[PDB]
């Protein structure tokens, strides 16, 4: 689709067998999801941005279907305010900005 | 332009007579800039996101030229890690997401 930005660019995703909503976030290098159950090995990690930092769990090679487009990659799991799809996955579904 | 997301979507902006770089950020409702000198009245404000919150100064009706496109609107000023152009201004320059 083409998505205007008068509202937050929220899409449905499927990850770890679960349905969620997430924000297409061009300002995020990485993909960060609220606490959730994901199978497998992970690594403790600290990420920052405005306001300070959070501890995350880093899970690699995770399959995620974003608005119907499949991608595989790294997903951080932790106390984010909202689920964020960052550029590491936006590139995989061919998302661009246009103006 | 069309902008892919293999790199951060950084554009040049002109605001308050100064040249800066800023990130086109679809995940941001608002526009937040590192400390800088802006003329006029402002209001103290607290914004949050991953990690906690920051105190900002809220300046309204500010003219900003983003990658050559003019817009006027609210700009928050404070301890953000990077200059962010949020949806309040992305809508004004006709920016969309496409995939
Ligand atoms: C967790 C993460 C990757 C992004 C979360 N953030 C909002 C992006 N929308 S942010 O304001 O903390 C932030 C934004 C941009 C940067 C940067 N280095 O350019 C660093 C941090
Ligand atoms: C300051 C601001 C507007 C955004 C900075 N952030 C990165 C966006 N890139 S964030 O991770 O703190 C954040 C992202 C999304 C939301 C939300 N409510 O959807 C709230 C906060």
Curated annotation (Swiss-Prot), chains A, B:
Oligomer status and interactors: Homodimer, whose active site consists of two apposed aspartic acid residues.
Originating gene: gag-pol
Domain Peptidase A2: 20-89
Annotated organism of origin: Human immunodeficiency virus type 1 group M subtype B (isolate BRU/LAI) (HIV-1)
Protein name per UniProt: Protease
Region of interest: Dimerization of protease: 1-5, 49-55, 88-99
Catalytic residues in the record: 25
Residues of the full protein shown: 501 to 599 of 1447
Origin organism lineage: Viruses, Riboviria, Pararnavirae, Artverviricota, Revtraviricetes
């Amino acid at each position: 689709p083409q998505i205007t930005l008068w509202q937050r660019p929220l899409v449905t995703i499927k990850i770890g067998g679960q349905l969620k909503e997430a924000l297409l976030d061009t300002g995020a290098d990485d993909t960060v999801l609220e606490e959730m159950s994901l199978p497998g090995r992970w690594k403790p990690k600290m990420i920052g941005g405005i306001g300070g930092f959070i501890k995350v769990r880093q899970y690699d090679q995770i399959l995620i279907e974003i608005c119907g487009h499949k991608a595989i990659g790294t997903v951080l799991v932790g106390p984010t305010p909202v689920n964020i799809i960052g550029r590491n996955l936006l590139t995989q579904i061919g998302c661009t900005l246009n103006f």
